[PDB]
Amino acid sequence: ATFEIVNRCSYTVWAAASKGDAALDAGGRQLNSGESWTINVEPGTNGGKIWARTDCYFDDSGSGICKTGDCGGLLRCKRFGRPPTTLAEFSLNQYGKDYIDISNIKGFNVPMNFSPTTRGCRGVRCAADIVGQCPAKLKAPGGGCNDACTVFQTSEYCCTTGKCGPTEYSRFFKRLCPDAFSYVLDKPTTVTCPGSSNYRVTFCPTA
Numbered sequence: 001a002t003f004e005i006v007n008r009c010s011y012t013v014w015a016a017a018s019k020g021d022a023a024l025d026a027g028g029r030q031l032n033s034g035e036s037w038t039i040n041v042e043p044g045t046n047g048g049k050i051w052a053r054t055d056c057y058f059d060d061s062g063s064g065i066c067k068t069g070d071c072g073g074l075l076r077c078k079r080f081g082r083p084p085t086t087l088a089e090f091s092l093n094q095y096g097k098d099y100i101d102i103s104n105i106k107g108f109n110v111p112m113n114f115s116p117t118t119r120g121c122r123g124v125r126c127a128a129d130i131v132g133q134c135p136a137k138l139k140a141p142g143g144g145c146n147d148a149c150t151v152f153q154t155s156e157y158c159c160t161t162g163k164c165g166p167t168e169y170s171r172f173f174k175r176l177c178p179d180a181f182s183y184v185l186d187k188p189t190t191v192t193c194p195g196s197s198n199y200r201v202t203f204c205p206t207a
């Protein structure tokens, strides 16, 4: 199924859609303000994230760097990004039931929306100004709020034991985005949908 990845910001991002060990369709392409981009995630992709990388520079070959969502310099993102990232997590068909969700488990970088394109379900969003209303010890240097996990690296933040709960750093991403995973275990905000359904991943929605 398809995934329109719309840039709606004022600044050029570099979208990216990948899984564990493989890119999706192409991998990730530059996006001037308003540029739309269509791809086709192979049906049955478990572990599919789409995100945006800001302040990236490249060369001909396809090898550079990104202040956010960097993934080994590979414009065509094969891996997941370097943490500080708002993710459109998804797993597709999964027993005739599709699964999508925004997440601030790996921080936040870009107000995102993950609406479905069909008549299958409602979508989600994460529009609020996190990066601005950031708590001091998260506002990353580059730009964007890292997550407590990546910043501090405690079991309580990154959830190793299995038994973890909300925090003040997780209750910041919740206060602002009530419809995205703050901590790794949060009362799932996932939305289930029909299998073989398409999606719009509008970065910077509402303007």
Ligand SMILES: [Cl-]
Residues within 6 Å of the ligand: 082, 083, 150
């Ligand atoms: Cl890091």
